[PDB]
């Protein structure tokens, strides 16, 4: 079989901290992982008015950066599964598992 973990977060310096802890734990217990791959960032952009009335020209410029990380695990070792499945990760990281 093959399990993969899709990781998404808002902060780029926070997504790689949660990514490296999974890969280091996997290499220590003897699992085969072909590293993490950087997926293209799906970034939204929001341009809305700052004024409630006339002077239309002054606006705000927002963005929402959503990075993506994927870790591919080849062998479903029981020592690998039992360790990674209940890790204590960052609150700003959403996990997606495909068993």
């Amino acid at each position: 079989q093959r399990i993969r973990i899709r990781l998404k977060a808002f902060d780029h310096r926070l997504i790689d901290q949660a990514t490296a802890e999974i890969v280091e734990t996997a290499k220590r217990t003897g699992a085969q992982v072909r590293g993490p791959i950087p997926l293209p960032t799906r970034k939204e952009r929001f341009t809305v008015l700052i004024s409630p009335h006339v002077n239309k020209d002054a606006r705000d410029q927002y963005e929402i950066r959503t990075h993506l990380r994927l870790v591919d695990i080849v062998e479903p070792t029981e020592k690998t599964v039992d360790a990674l499945m209940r890790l204590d990760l960052a609150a700003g990281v959403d996990v997606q598992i495909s068993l």
Binding site: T47, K56, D57, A58, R59, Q61
Partner: protein, 127 residues
């Protein structure tokens, strides 16, 4: 022996693969005359191979994605110059003199708030 050089433009990206000896040009599994519909686009890639003489002397195998007519052609023209510097390494002084190794980094100016275009302002009243 292969000699590689990366050249690109606004949204293009082109690879250059050099093999010694032919006058063959293969771009995206097509010919030089078949792919380039513009006659100017055929000649601008011949511009870096003007000071350095090529007739039937080296292969070039190129692919390119993105951009347009001259955006792909400018990507090839940059990529050949880095390949010849990889090929001979003494040819740099002639390439610096022509100005082809300088990557054209003039990108598009962003669309501004309050204006319909990058610098074009909507029409103005005096009083």
């Amino acid at each position: 022996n292969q000699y590689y050089g990366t050249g690109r433009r606004k949204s293009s990206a082109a690879r250059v693969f050099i093999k010694p000896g032919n006058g063959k040009i293969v771009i995206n599994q097509r010919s030089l005359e078949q792919y380039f519909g513009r006659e100017t686009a055929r000649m601008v890639v011949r511009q870096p191979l003007e000071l350095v003489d090529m007739v039937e002397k080296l292969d070039l195998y190129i692919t390119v994605k993105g951009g347009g007519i001259s955006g792909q052609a400018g990507a090839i023209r940059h990529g050949i110059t880095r390949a010849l510097m990889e090929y001979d390494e003494s040819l740099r002084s002639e390439l610096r003199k022509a100005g082809f190794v300088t990557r054209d980094a003039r990108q598009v100016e962003r669309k501004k708030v309050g204006l319909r275009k990058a610098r074009r302002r909507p029409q103005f009243s005096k009083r």
